[PDB]
């Protein structure tokens, strides 16, 4: 029974045998339980002063790898178990739940949500460009079919890159890795259809000037000159090539 | 309470280990506590010494026969 | 508990006389004067005191124990620890506080020159000094952070004496640095032209380096610190000198160089040879470290500018990089920089390369003048 | 704590670190239970987070539209993003460290991130100068060149990367003309 | 034309127009 | 004096380790310094009073180093060796 271990910290406060218990370390030198607890407590103070106007939309959830899985599904285009594409993921409208982080109630959902809104836009944009043929202002047009098919190709590559590169990665890594892809996606969403705060290119509604068919073979040339300033130079070159492929065929 | 008892027993064991090594008694680790735990029952220490001496003689004899 | 919280909770750490000497001292005062009222003192843990001191040395501006008054870090008079006497605790905290105040002032100066509060280009030498100070404070803060991590882990009994002893070499380096900084910067009037302030700082650095080089191995960490500081501070000045000598264009936005170009003499002016480059006179403003070679450097730079203007009719290490490379090469050809006087190291590494370049430039100019102008 | 710091580096002010339209991200003065020294360190970091937020807003403002205009302005925004990329990488490393030891202290982060407190302000000063002077087209190149004579080696390298992107644009335009 | 920093730079259609105009003219 | 500081730290740790230790324990642990320190203080005060300069510091240190106290002898030998290392460095520079 001699085999017990004892503390090697000897303090200058008890001159007998101290237990060794510290002073309840400071908030900023430890977290993950006290972080969330302090955040929840500050939000509780604010909710007391507000009359309970937070109501913890997803106070905690899911985990790391499961929240990452839901976010990766939303980025693929299947809305997450707390996220709808082009729809508020959480029923909290404070930046703890729309929050890169705060450890606050909803803030665990919020770190995902802040990047998620872009992913929901990406999902709806990938649906917009997923089929090469579409009703109304998108029917007929071989250059339009080529453009939409190549965009769906890139959307698919983006969706396979997500939830295949970052399995079980924290939200921060997921968002940092996907920021350079989602910004290009958002630029193309302004260029293309629904999946954006501007439906199509032009307007912000289902009556956007975005051409199709030979009208698109026009439209794209000015859109290509007028903007290529994010990451579209190789992509826009390929898109112009494939859009001209039906035009070049006809000619 | 249990923490204090564990601390006390650890320090007592360390002190006894040091006393043993300074006296060059020659005893190994297993006589860490149990042998002394037996002596703490009030057992005749002279007889305990005699028996442990006999066991040491037997062990040396057996190790000599084996070697 | 947040010691910055105004609720004094008196927790007795133990009943042991050796653990409550402060309480014993207050009881002695109460027993010697029946009207003695104990001062209302905030009870702080020794570990908390250590952590606040580490934060002070790390540059935290708002400490509860150490109040900054008039730019001096002062201990709040109403602090008590159970295991230290108030006078002893005060004395030790004040000994640390003197260095804390020095560091605080130096960090304030670093922030000032860094611009983290003029359409004039940065005084590159002062910027380099600020960067070197930042690097030294970086390494000191890194060591402080490792000590803080050891404290935070609570795996071993860390006492204030152990911490003070561990920091002793760093405290010594800091004390030397504070003396050097005061002499090199605080003594230079702000109403001094940038060239004059720079020359005074550079001469103070040179003299301090020469003073400390004779002390030997026992000051090795201080000699190495001062050597790195001098190399970094002269890097931009020597680069400007190198740039003017090589390209013939002085891009000196700060007027920091001891030689001022008189703009009133065009290169086609008769006085170009005489008036294009004037030494600033306060007493020529001469950079002491350049003094042996200063004349050759000035003549070479003027000659190179002239040669470039004459030829316009028809892999090189920067002075800073070459200085650094020669310092590293001497460290290799040798606790290893304090056994050779910094002045001997400069005399043997830097001046020969400059003299070679001067001779080459003047020879090229002379060859051009001999061939093209048939002098 | 550590997660909220990473959030602030991600540009989303929280309850302790609040977003002010004028100041960017800053530490709330009202957060109780922090030692004042901890609040001071947090606010020193929050100054960087504020500058990061403002820089991100600027990058989005001047790249996100596919008034000052030009390929050089786009290159400037791309340069700013590429200069924040090393900050993003350092933030990822800090995140990994905090995932490895949840007991890690803020002092470790402040030490690991101190270099960015110096790198970011100089580039932000140069960017704000370009903005305030409305430097346009190749005049942005002129401004960057003028700023390249600065003494900060980290700043020098960052500005060299920006200049390299701008020179790639200048060289493309030169090739087209010539 | 191409504002993304990558006739690789510069967007045009003359690399495609010439082989088409050659046959139109023929 | 650095070894004295280290011994003081070790004594501090020991007294933190056993609360039943007496002040006499500290006095025993520090008794060895009671002999070294007075001799070095005598040498220091001699250097101060005589304003010994340059190599005369070396001469003074040697003369006091000739004392019979082994602790003093070892300390003064270390000091003299460092000072001779400096004198020899200047000699090296000259020669």
From TrEMBL, chain B:
Coiled coil: none annotated. It is found in: Cytoplasm, Cytoskeleton, Microtubule organizing center. The keyword Protein biosynthesis does not apply. GO terms for biological process: gamma-tubulin complex localization. The keyword Zinc does not apply. Keywords: Cytoplasm, Cytoskeleton. GO terms for cellular component: centrosome; gamma-tubulin ring complex; spindle. Belongs to the MOZART1 family. This is Mitotic spindle organizing protein 1. It comes from Sus scrofa. The chain holds residues 10 to 76 of 79 of the full protein.
Automatic annotation (TrEMBL), chain C:
Residues 50-332 form the Gamma tubulin complex component protein N-terminal domain. It is found in: Cytoplasm, Cytoskeleton, Microtubule organizing center, Centrosome. It comes from the Eukaryota. Signal peptide: none annotated. Component of the gamma-tubulin ring complex (gTuRC) consisting of TUBGCP2, TUBGCP3, TUBGCP4, TUBGCP5 and TUBGCP6 and gamma-tubulin TUBG1 or TUBG2. TUBGCP2, TUBGCP3, TUBGCP4, TUBGCP5 and TUBGCP6 assemble in a 5:5:2:1:1 stoichiometry; each is associated with a gamma-tubulin, thereby arranging 14 gamma-tubulins in a helical manner. Gamma-tubulin at the first position is blocked by TUBGCP3 at the last position, allowing 13 protafilaments to grow into a microtubule. Component of the gamma-tubulin ring complex (gTuRC) which mediates microtubule nucleation. The gTuRC regulates the minus-end nucleation of alpha-beta tubulin heterodimers that grow into microtubule protafilaments, a critical step in centrosome duplication and spindle formation. Belongs to the TUBGCP family. This is Gamma-tubulin complex component. The gene is TUBGCP5.
From TrEMBL, chain E:
It is found in: Cytoplasm, Cytoskeleton, Microtubule organizing center, Centrosome. It comes from the Eukaryota. Belongs to the TUBGCP family. Component of the gamma-tubulin ring complex (gTuRC) consisting of TUBGCP2, TUBGCP3, TUBGCP4, TUBGCP5 and TUBGCP6 and gamma-tubulin TUBG1 or TUBG2. TUBGCP2, TUBGCP3, TUBGCP4, TUBGCP5 and TUBGCP6 assemble in a 5:5:2:1:1 stoichiometry; each is associated with a gamma-tubulin, thereby arranging 14 gamma-tubulins in a helical manner. Gamma-tubulin at the first position is blocked by TUBGCP3 at the last position, allowing 13 protafilaments to grow into a microtubule. Component of the gamma-tubulin ring complex (gTuRC) which mediates microtubule nucleation. The gTuRC regulates the minus-end nucleation of alpha-beta tubulin heterodimers that grow into microtubule protafilaments, a critical step in centrosome duplication and spindle formation. This is Gamma-tubulin complex component 6. It comes from Sus scrofa (Pig). The chain holds residues 1359 to 1394 of 1715 of the full protein.
Automatic annotation (TrEMBL), chain F:
Transmembrane segments: none annotated. It comes from the Eukaryota. It is found in: Cytoplasm, Cytoskeleton, Microtubule organizing center, Centrosome. Component of the gamma-tubulin ring complex (gTuRC) which mediates microtubule nucleation. The gTuRC regulates the minus-end nucleation of alpha-beta tubulin heterodimers that grow into microtubule protafilaments, a critical step in centrosome duplication and spindle formation. Belongs to the TUBGCP family. Component of the gamma-tubulin ring complex (gTuRC) consisting of TUBGCP2, TUBGCP3, TUBGCP4, TUBGCP5 and TUBGCP6 and gamma-tubulin TUBG1 or TUBG2. TUBGCP2, TUBGCP3, TUBGCP4, TUBGCP5 and TUBGCP6 assemble in a 5:5:2:1:1 stoichiometry; each is associated with a gamma-tubulin, thereby arranging 14 gamma-tubulins in a helical manner. Gamma-tubulin at the first position is blocked by TUBGCP3 at the last position, allowing 13 protafilaments to grow into a microtubule. This is Gamma-tubulin complex component. It comes from Sus scrofa. The gene is ADAL. The chain holds residues 97 to 191 of 667 of the full protein.
